[PDB]
Amino acid sequence: TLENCVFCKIIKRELPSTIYYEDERVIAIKDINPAAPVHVLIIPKEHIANVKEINESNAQILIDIHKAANKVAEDLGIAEKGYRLITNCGVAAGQTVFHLHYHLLGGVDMGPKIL
Amino acid sequence: TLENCVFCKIIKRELPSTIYYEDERVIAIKDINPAAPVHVLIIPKEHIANVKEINESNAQILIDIHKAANKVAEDLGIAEKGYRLITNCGVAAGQTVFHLHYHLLGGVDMGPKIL
Ligand SMILES: [Zn+2]
Ligand SMILES: [Zn+2]
Secondary structure, X not given: OOOOOHHHHHHOOOOOOOEEEEOOOEEEEEOOOOOOOEEEEEXXXXXXXXXXXXXXXXXXXXXXXXXXXXXXXXXXXXXXXXXXXXXXXXXXXXXXXXXXXXXXXXXXXXXXXXX | OOOOOHHHHHHOOOOOOOEEEEXXXXXXXXXXXXXXXXXXXXXXXXXXXXXXXXOOOOOOHHHHHHHXXXXXXXXXXXXXXXXXXXXXXXXXXXXXXXXXXXXXXXXXXXXXXXX
């Protein structure tokens, strides 16, 4: 855990959340400034800055991350039409919370341009 | 392999490519219609439609995928400023080639809006 990390705080129940999935390794929460009708953040409980810090010792968390993305996509009714997953590394990529997460986005036709 | 899949063809050398990383499980190639100065597709050799088909039996490929994304991000000089990874499931999410891949995007400030 990092003292000053909003997601770490959310995990330890120092701030509120809307939690769509949870276990000892990962949590999935509602993004409070959604960029699409369904916008969930899939967050590993271990504080790691972004995917640049993933390596041989911790990489299994990617599995949990994608597992929970799929389960939540089903639970929230976007799985069949589909969805986008995004993770960012660094401020140039738009990262503003430096604790690894994927954005699960869905419920609107997002179309051709990915950027 | 699927007969009619462009990426499968690329892998079997029936079409050309610019290949930044390769082993028996994964390949990373240049996107020929780049959406950013660096735009690489990270593609598992096994033909799977998108991440909705990832499950307990095949999920280890996510690791290879993120490993190669990181190595290529370093090789191409975008790792330090950072980068975005994107994968899409379904036409509503903008998927047009139905063989699982991540887009590795970098070399330009992409900023706040992820969609
Ligand atoms: Zn944290
Ligand atoms: Zn294929």
